[PDB]
Design a protein around this ligand. Structure first.
Ligand SMILES: Cc1cc2nc3c(=O)[nH]c(=O)nc-3n(C[C@H](O)[C@H](O)[C@H](O)COP(=O)(O)O)c2cc1C
Ligand SMILES: Cc1cc2nc3c(=O)[nH]c(=O)nc-3n(C[C@H](O)[C@H](O)[C@H](O)COP(=O)(O)O)c2cc1C
Lengths: 164, 162, 174, 163, 163, 164, 164, 164, 174, 163, 164, 164
């Protein structure tokens, strides 16, 4: 196994299927923990993930969580699914919630998997920020567009983009 | 009439007069719907707008509103009044609330009407973002004037159509 | 004394020691008032500062506070401690809370004192924003640094430390 | 300027435009303060009026407000917009909220500007009360019409109050 | 069928049996909708009436309900049971809640069915108001008795409204 | 002693002294019970009166209190102190709270002691109503005046206005 | 009169008319008290029954009510209206609320008046339980098939089933 | 398409994957609506299902939902996943919540898909109830045992069983 | 010591004395943990048991407690005191709360100690269920009974009583 | 059988066994009533005791209970178990809850049964206060030990209170 | 006239009449301010006092009040009515609420008017504490007695005791 | 290092600087844990101390905390800052909260560091209690004095006083 991995889930419709990635990834990484964005809590009951993840970081239960330790405790940090909003915040250094604060601190171990409707993907400001992220050592995976649509990355494809 | 128009209202002091624009615009567009920023709810009772608008999009009443459909359902999207904050968020692609998420998705049908005190208008970062928006096909209206005042119906009508 | 000074405190761990700066600064400025970021309220009981400051601006107690008047009422506006988050928001003109709205309006009287862990300080996007702020007349102090032991790595690392009273007055008045 | 003026706003749909009257009236009266009926708070955020008015009397924030002092502090008291409900309460001396208690105490400085749908205006009991008010020195403006009644033109309220 | 009918129920002990009238009246009128007074909600669970009525107007669920439309949407408006309090409010044009505001607006289509203890019925002020209502085209049914007053027969309720 | 007496207190600044009338009245009547208007609560803590009166009738504690029984239970019903608002309500038959409903039903046993600022007392509408009350046999006491302002009645004067 | 009678009302639509039975039964039994199932409180304001009943047993107001005393205090215990749910719980000895605990304890004085839509009445499991109840000395009344259709036990009917 | 289908989901760990069945079933039935057990709400945010289902029946939002109409409005009623608890309640006619009340009323259109740990599956009382259900026309899918424990019925399995 | 033992306490009046059994049983079993029925919380403050028990399973504090693990973690599961309601639920496989779900899963390690007024004990449906439980390998102890005087009257009546600690030890270890 | 007895229970761990004393003492005193310290509610559900006691005084249910009458209805007032804290409060006349107010008032018929860990018992101030209590007519019982410290045997408490 | 005076009112039943002192005292002292003990709130609505006093100090409204400044702002601190509990707290230095913290700080300007039932007045501990207080420059009034029970001090007497 | 040390912090204005003492003391004692008085929670967010202390004893989070174990687990117990109120409570054996109960139990390991305004320090009752504490083996550090006001303990002096 490759070491501790942290999943930073955002308010993308596909966050409802995040449990599938967890059990799958639990086979390749020592640990697979998770952290959600405030808005993603409107899509699922995050406490359920405690049944699949090694650890769940909840900023509501604990408002004084140490983001620095969280970053040092992991070798890989994935933002999956990654919303246009969080992508753009990270690109501009905006860290107004735990997830986003963790992503600023650990930009060097960051892997972003964009997920959104195709029309949002065409936004000029989003794209400009994606270029900015790439030109600064932040790994941004290119969305799997199959309809013109846009699907969620294959569990194999995520492994390649991170380890390879 | 020209088709469905959506008003994205932000926390500007003039949002308290947004009802006047609605009834006026209802005469030129098939429909005139409205969507507010969370903060603008501290200035007015948004439910009242249900009495003038065809539809009110409330993200609190319905947290799973489809922003894509909202955008496809309109030919024009105005951010009136437009706060410095929202202008700057849109310019940077930040969409942390429904209104702002709708503006990212529909940048091609977007018309911005800035409203703020003159001193805020002079902010370097705001201005840099306004240039960015204009150089990217987002229509941004030049604030009237001593202080900035709301746009005249005559003007919004021209700007949104020309 | 030099005139009214406003402190804009953000959610930095050192906001718990902000009271020390207040009493100290009260000796050089006619008034020293304070305004906190929503998140900083998770670190301290902000009402206590009413005992040291001349005025406390609370956007929860009063959601319709006039930020323009707040800015005109002060000659100096310090963001101390200044979080990476607020620095980056100011740099991009994002003003989604009172503190941050006050900073947009008063960019000409703004003095920023960064405070964060050294690793956050190395963020490319933060640094790019800091340059942007400086190249636009916003005074951004260079975070003081000192040798400190880090139990994590079991090694001495250079850590970012909080401004010195002399160093804050000097940076502000000079 | 003519002296302190108090606006007593009621739950009429037009209370959403009361801010326009304030800024306008601020030019003719030393002060223009406001007081709302409990129900009118379902139409607007009354705190916003603090930005236009000199003073806002809020009975929820302060349940022990002195209505007598409020009345002595003003030379003119306008109920604008005036709902059928408040008009009828005043006519019968019913004062179950601050606004309505202020109107009982200051009947001598009272100016009423009715606003309601035309059908409500035709109510026999309302009309009987309006006559009662007029025959007792309470100034009641005649709803501008054109059939439907509309809000008081600002030069008209000014004329009705001063002249 | 004769058209849409609205029942305005008030805080009378017999409001607990209002469901019986609904199902019965549903056979003679296109629609039979209902609106309650705030106080009547202390006697029954008003949501249950949604199971018998075509529509339930709830001012708490929707504070901005259009009373004018409610009145235009009905040919008959019954206040059943009608409390002394509401009768007296209507007589004086007091409309401080939706039900009572609907009754002011639709005085021309109003039918009142008083229900209260016999001693309350003897109140001078109530009686004076009842006369006032009758002398102004408001139909006020004469309570059935036997000495104590009882509720309206379903046969008798129909006569009063339909002719 | 005389029969049971009920005090109906309204939102008059003097409802804060109401406890004084109770102990004194308590020496002449079998029972002296009390009932308040909802607005009275903003002046005093009505529960303390439980310590002086034989019975406190609270509509919030018990929303379905039987108002006919309360009237049948007393020989004298005193609305003391009486606000302009309750006086005008009773006069028009408005009975929208328990106190005002008890007064509609017991008009034949009702005694009113007005208390309010001298300026409120000059209102034409209230006066028309006071006349209406008296002309319908509801005893309304003539407010005491002392140089000109109205003052509360002495226990001796209420005793006299109620028994004789 | 025949002695104290307790009505155990359940979440049947007809519980909204339970007040009619009370006043009627008050003429044949020394006392007629009532106890509701938690769910029936979604159909009516149970406090109103205090105006017709001698006593109302409320397990929310008093969580430590003595069910044994309640049973000893009555000669007859009627479950009216009786829901399919409560019938089936009683048949299986399930007593997870006060009403149902009272019915287990007083099976010997129990009279059940079923009320439900005709389709629910045809349930195999319900019927099997009804047989079980009858073969164990629990009186179960046979509903009114009139409009198939279901109806409530006429006062005479309930009266005659209980005194018989 | 075969007509309206209702899914009654219970507090089984697999209820977190119920969304997958919905989208799949939406292709064979005119409508696919859903109703949850109170306890299942501790596993997921049920409001999200509004995005996949035609209708969501929520007894908290509406305590007076007509279970009879719900049953008449559907040709098929599946309890998927079906907990040991709900299976046993249905078998005994216990209907103390909306889902369970709907299952009593519509026993003739009921299809049960058991899901639980293998050890719970071996319970004597559960098994006795399963036999009872089967011998009374209630279709109870017979779960598959693999590796050793019960596995959740495949979408193909539910389709074949429901449409057989 | 014989291994981990779990006590499933129900809403019986005697649950107020459950602490006595705990300390006593702690001497014969490696661990003695406890789990309460929702209704039993109206009789006592369950948190107090944390002072005598090794572990307290609280489904309110943690709605996603693993009942399977709870069962595997114990060699003996006692329902003490056992109410008529829970006995009848277990007999019918009804598991609508944690305690009752634990009892379904661990029917093979289950020991029931009935406690209720004598009149409830005579219920036909309860008795039929007790037979069902016994004929299915669930150990159900025969309630103790002595002749106690009452004040509810002047008569002496037969009454069921709580099991002596020697009684539950013998019923559980044979 | 002797007069009415009142138990004043405090936040001692042993308050969880107070129900046992109740039924035992019930057979000797006309009435055995109870009152608890606020902190006591963290150990037991104080309402269950209504099932064993004649009366239960609860200051939250009724914040205006007459402690004078409470002391008069009883001939014996026991503070059992007696915590160090209440023992010290009583000794210094501190009465900030219903229980200690009752104790300040009924000091002449008060009997204290200390129950605490052996280490708290050796505290200088606690002992000093116990001396002051004994030197002022308050019966303070001598805790049973075995070196631990246990609760009052039923016979023991009767001896101390009656004899 | 005389300087600022402060009334520290405690939970004595006579606190319901403290309003009568205020008006009278306001004629001899520049300002007459007040602050109550938490328990006092159970007897009266302290908000009304704002209608009579110059300033009311509320520790619930503002938990960070400056007691030093308060003691510093007044020339006379009266605890009226003074309860047993407070008298003893002050004697032992206990200062667990605002009132009591103000009394410890301004013991040099303290005037105490005991009010309680005659039986409590006889408490040994209370009386010894009063001896202790009087020996430390704290003035404690000896309660008037009539009828036998203690009664509240009249103005002439609080005026005398305080101004001598 | 000298062993486990417990800090008992009270509602003194300087409790806002207690974090400084913690980090400093963490270098001389194996562990440095903390316990706050209910009132001190109005000055700071006590949860933050979890970031500097080894353990935080919170009586609200856990109402049944074992004070005896807390005392046995520490070699030194400091009340820093020590309010006049707590000092006086300890002196009289009053233990109405966890902190104060811990101080009664561990009087032999107790070290008190007074902090209050100079005027409060002059209170006769406080001083009498301080003498009482000293004459009973409770170490009471003499407040550092520097204009004339009292100031907080130099970490060097707290060490001397506690270690000698
Ligand atoms: C959306 C809406 C608009 C209304 N407009 C009017 C109006 O113009 N005039 C009026 O007299 N009443 C109007 N009503 C009815 C009043 O709000 C209602 O009678 C109320 O009880 C009056 O209370 P007030 O006298 O305290 O303001 C309206 C109600 C609603 C919900
Ligand atoms: C802002 C403020 C600061 C205070 N400072 C002190 C202080 O330095 N010393 C002190 O003994 N009391 C001080 N007090 C008073 C105490 O907080 C008060 O006596 C309290 O009841 C003590 O409670 P404790 O012993 O549980 O901490 C202060 C009060 C406030 C509101």
């Amino acid at each position: 196994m490759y070491g501790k991995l942290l999943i930073c889930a955002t308010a993308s419709i596909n966050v409802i299927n995040i449990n599938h990635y967890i059990v799958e990834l639990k086979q390749h990484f020592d640990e697979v923990n998770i952290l959600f964005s405030p808005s993603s809590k409107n899509f699922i009951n995050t406490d359920v993930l405690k049944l699949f993840c090694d650890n769940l970081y909840d900023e509501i239960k604990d408002p004084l969580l140490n983001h620095i330790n969280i970053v040092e405790n992991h070798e890989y940090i994935l933002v999956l699914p990654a919303s246009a909003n969080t992508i753009n915040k990270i690109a501009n250094g905006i860290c107004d919630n735990l997830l986003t604060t963790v992503c600023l601190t650990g930009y060097q171990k960051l892997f972003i998997f964009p997920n959104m409707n195709i029309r949002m993907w065409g936004n000029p400001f989003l794209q400009k920020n994606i270029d900015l992220l790439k030109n600064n050592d932040v790994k941004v995976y290119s969305p799997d567009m199959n309809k013109n649509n846009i699907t969620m990355p294959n569990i194999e494809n995520v492994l390649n983009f991170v380890l390879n």
